[PDB]
Design a binder for this molecule. Sequence first.
Ligand SMILES: Nc1ncnc2c1ncn2[C@@H]1O[C@H](COP(=O)(O)OP(=O)(O)OP(=O)(O)O)[C@@H](O)[C@H]1O
Ligand SMILES: Nc1ncnc2c1ncn2[C@@H]1O[C@H](COP(=O)(O)OP(=O)(O)OP(=O)(O)O)[C@@H](O)[C@H]1O
Ligand SMILES: [Mg+2]
Ligand SMILES: [Mg+2]
Lengths: 355, 355, 52, 57
Amino acid sequence: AKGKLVLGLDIGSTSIKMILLKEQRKRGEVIYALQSFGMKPLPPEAIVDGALMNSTAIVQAVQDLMSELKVKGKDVAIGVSGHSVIIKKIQMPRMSQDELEESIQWEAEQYIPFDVKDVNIDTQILDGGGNDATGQMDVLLVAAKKDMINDYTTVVSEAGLAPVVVDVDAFAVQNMFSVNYDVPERETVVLINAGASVVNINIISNGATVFTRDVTIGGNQFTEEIQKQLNVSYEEAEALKIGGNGADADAVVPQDVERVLSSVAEQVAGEIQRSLDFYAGTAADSNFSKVYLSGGTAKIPALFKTIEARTGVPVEILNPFRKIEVDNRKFDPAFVMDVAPMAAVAVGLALRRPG
Amino acid sequence: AKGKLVLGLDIGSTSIKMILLKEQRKRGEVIYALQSFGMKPLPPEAIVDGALMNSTAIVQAVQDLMSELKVKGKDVAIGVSGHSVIIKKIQMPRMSQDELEESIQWEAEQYIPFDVKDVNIDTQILDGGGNDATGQMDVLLVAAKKDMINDYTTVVSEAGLAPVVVDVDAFAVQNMFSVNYDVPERETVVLINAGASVVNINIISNGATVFTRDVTIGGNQFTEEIQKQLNVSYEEAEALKIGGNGADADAVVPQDVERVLSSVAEQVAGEIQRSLDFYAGTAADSNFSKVYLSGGTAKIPALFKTIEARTGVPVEILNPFRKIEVDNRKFDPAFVMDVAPMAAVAVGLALRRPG
Amino acid sequence: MDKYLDQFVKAPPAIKFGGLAFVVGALTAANFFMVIQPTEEEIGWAVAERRK
Amino acid sequence: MMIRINLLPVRAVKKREMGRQVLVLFAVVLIGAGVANYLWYDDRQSELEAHQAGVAS
Ligand SMILES: Nc1ncnc2c1ncn2[C@@H]1O[C@H](COP(=O)(O)OP(=O)(O)OP(=O)(O)O)[C@@H](O)[C@H]1O
Ligand SMILES: Nc1ncnc2c1ncn2[C@@H]1O[C@H](COP(=O)(O)OP(=O)(O)OP(=O)(O)O)[C@@H](O)[C@H]1O
Ligand SMILES: [Mg+2]
Ligand SMILES: [Mg+2]
C-alpha cells in the first residue's frame, strides 16, 4: 500500500546507515529528493557470518536511526548480507510463470548447500519480452538461507518498520548509477563495492548486469592487519587506517602502515585480476572500458590509482546523490560527496522504495 | 456507444495534455476539426515507474484539464506509459480468432517477466487478408502489467471520464502523420518521439509499422544533468534547458549548458545508432530515407541538425495539426505549430476517438 | 506494496458497492436486534398475564 | 497502421471481477440473515397469539 518507504544499510557491518528520499516540491514542481540521512557505527554482536544475531540490539540501533532522521515513515526496503546470499546465473526454458518458478527451484536445488529451508528469487538477465516459447531463458537466482531473512524481519518488526523489499546490495548499489549507465549501452562497465565484510564486483553492458562475484576480502582485512602489526584494538586500528592513511601530515606513517597493509593490497589486486580473468569468456581479443567504486573500503587513499594501474581499467569514485534532488539549504554538497561511497546502497534500495 | 470521446496525454510525466477534435460545420460542409486543447504540468508523485500512483491527484488534474477545455464530453481514449508496456513482434500460424488469441497468450507468456496478471492485445503487421490457413501469421503484442491499466482506469473513473481505448504512444503519435506516410508506400520512414520519460523509435514502410524500440533516455536526462552540474532544482534546470538553450541572447550559455548536456547528447546518439544498426537485418547494402520528430525533448535547440548529421538520416520536425481542420479565428497557427511536438500523441489517440 | 493504498485512498464502483454493502449489513443487524427485543418484551408480558 | 486497445485487461479485469464476487457474497449473506430475521418474526407472532389467548383466559 503506497507510502514512500525507507532504506537502511542493514548489512553495513561497520555502519548502519539510513536514507529518506521522497518527492520534494519547489515552485509547483516536484521530484525525488533527499529528505534525510543518518549513520551509526554498528554495535557488533549484532551481525555474525551475515546473520542478524542480536535482533534486539539491532532493533534499538535502527530506532536510533529513525529518531536521528526525524522521519515519520515506518515502511522500509533493506538488503541481505553478501555473505548470506548466493547469486548466480541459470539457463532454462521460459514458459508459464509457475513452470518457471518450479523449474528454477529445481535447478537451484543443485546450487544450494542447505535444505530449502531457502529463499529463491530470480530475475531475467534479458527481457523475456524477446524470445519464443521453450527458448532462450536466462534467470539469475538470488538464494538465501531462510533466517538470515527471518533475523532481519525480526529486527525490522520490533523497530516498528514494515519491510516491502528485501533486495541485494550488489544490484541495489547500482540504482544510483543506473541512469548514467543506461546512457552508454554497449559499453562494458565494472562496479566495485568494497565494503567491510565483502567486496562485490558486478559487470554490465549498459545498466544490464552481465555478472556478479563476491570476494571475502574487504576493509576489515586492512584494519585487521594494522591491528595485528601494532597490537591495537579494532577501533584504533580503524582510525589509524582512516586518518592515518590520508592526512596531509601522514608522511611518516605510510611506511609503517603501508608495510602493514601491503599484503592485503597485493592479494586484493590478485583477487580482482582473478575475477576479471574468470569473466573474459567470449572476447579473447578485447580490452576493458570504465569502472566505478562504492563502499568505504574504496576510500583507502590512493587505492583508486592502484586498482587503475593494476587492473588495466579506469577506476573512478562516483557520486550517487546526483540521481536525486538535493536542497543546498539542508545539505552541504561537499559532505554529501564525502560520504557518498558508504551511502551508495543506502540510497540504492531507497530509490527502490518510492518506485 | 457513439460520442466523439476525448484524449488526454496521461503518460506525459512532464505534462498532462488533452485535445478535443470533432466535426466542425462550415458552409454546410463538416470535417474533423480542432475544438479545444489544454495542458498542465504534471504534479509529480502522480506517476512513478510508469504506474499512476496518486490516482486522486491525477484525477483532480484531469478535472482541471476538462474545465480549462470547456468540454462537455466525458468519454476518453488514453495511453499507457512506454515504461509500462512491452511491445514486440511475434510469429505464429493464423487460424480461428480464439486459437490465435490463446496461441498469442501462450507465446507471449514466455515474453512477460510477470504473472498474467498481464494485458495482452495484438495486431497483425500485415493484413491477415493476405495469407492462407496455417500460414504466414505475424502479430505484434502489446503486453502490460495489469494495474498500470487499473491505476489509469481509477484515474479516469473519478475524473468522470469513461475510457473506450487504452492505446500505446509509439503508434498513437503516428495517426497524425498516417496519411502523409500512406502517400509514400515503399519509403522507409523513422519516427522518433523524444519524451520526458522515454524515447520511442518506430520505423515504417508507408504507414505500416515495421518495428518499435523504446529507450530509457529522454529529456529528464538533459534536465537532470543540468541540475547535477549547477546544483539546481528540477524546475529551474528545466527552464535553463528550455529558454537557456534557445534564446537569441543565449551566446554565453551554450558552453556552460552544452558542456553539461554533452554526455547526454553523445550517449543518446549512441543509443539511436544502436537501435538503427540493430534493425538493418535484411538490406545489408542500402541506406535510409526520411524521418520525423515528436515530443518536447526533440525541441532541444539544434538537436534536429545533430541527429541528422549523426544518424545519416534527414530528421525533421512535423506539424501534426495538418491532419485536422483548424479555425484561424479560434487558434493561432503559429502557437499551434510551436506546441505541435508535445501534442502529437495528444491529438493522436484523439483521431482514434472519433474513429 | 504501493498501488493498493492508492486504490484504498481512491475508490469508485467497487467501493461504492462496498459501502452500500456495509450499510445494508448494519441495517440488517439493526432490524434483527429490533426483532429480538420484542421477543424479550413479549416473554415479559407473558409472565405478567400468567401471574394475573 | 496498428490500432491497439488495452481496454479491459487485466488488473482492471480481475479487479472488476473481484469487485463483483465480493458483492455477490455480501448479497448472499444478507439474504440469509434476512431469512433468519423472518423465521424469528413468525415464531414471535405465534407466541403473541398464544399469549393473547392466555390474556383472554
Ligand atoms: N577514509 C577511509 N580510508 C580507509 N578506509 C575507510 C575510510 N573510510 C571508511 N573506510 C572503511 O570502509 C568500511 C566502511 O565502509 P562502508 O560503510 O561503505 O562499508 P559497509 O557497507 O558498512 O560494509 P559491508 O556492506 O561490506 O558490510 C570500514 O571498514 C572502514 O574501515
Ligand atoms: N524548447 C525546449 N527545449 C528543450 N527541451 C524542451 C523544450 N520544450 C520542452 N522540452 C522538454 O520536453 C519534455 C516535455 O515534452 P513532451 O510533453 O512532448 O514529453 P511528454 O510526452 O510529456 O513525456 P513522456 O511522454 O515521455 O512522458 C520535458 O522534459 C521538457 O524538458
Ligand atoms: Mg555496504
Ligand atoms: Mg509523450
